[PDB]
Ligand binder design. Sequence first.
Ligand code: U6N
Length: 151
Amino acid sequence: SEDELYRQSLEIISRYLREQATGAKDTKPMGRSGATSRKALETLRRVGDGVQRNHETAFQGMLRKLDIKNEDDVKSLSRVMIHVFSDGVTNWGRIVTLISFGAFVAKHLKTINQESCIEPLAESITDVLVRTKRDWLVKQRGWDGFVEFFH
Ligand SMILES: CC#CCn1c(CC)c(-c2cccc(Cl)c2C)c2c(N[C@H](Cc3ccccc3)C(=O)O)ncnc21
């Protein structure tokens, strides 16, 4: 390991997706740069909840199209994130939509009683995000850049 950016990203995304699914704020330290991952998570809650709320109908229609039922559909969803998220313009706007739709999908995984697929979903999203937009993420100062961008 010793990929700080991947570790920090996976943590923030797992916390958001897990707490959206279940309602509970997970109380367990944070990790390295914990004040930058707690301010990132705070921001993500504000802006991410906003995107799910404002574009609920769009999110519902996309979820319906993907027809997600098991670990096999979540594993596949990865090829879908590469086509849609990676093959686009790069900005925090689309990065939030990716993690917000992931949270929307994580809520659906809980309701269809497949909540063991949440942590893998979070890993899939972090994989596509960090190992297709690494160059851009580094240039923007990673999650310090994100928190700054949503002042
Ligand atoms: C988990 C995951 C994932 C991948 N992903 C997906 C899922 C395939 C979409 C997407 C594409 C079309 C419609 C909808 Cl509702 C969505 C969510 C997406 C995305 N969408 C925005 C457009 C948009 C913004 C806000 C609300 C609805 C739609 C875009 O393409 O610029 N941006 C980034 N990643 C996206």
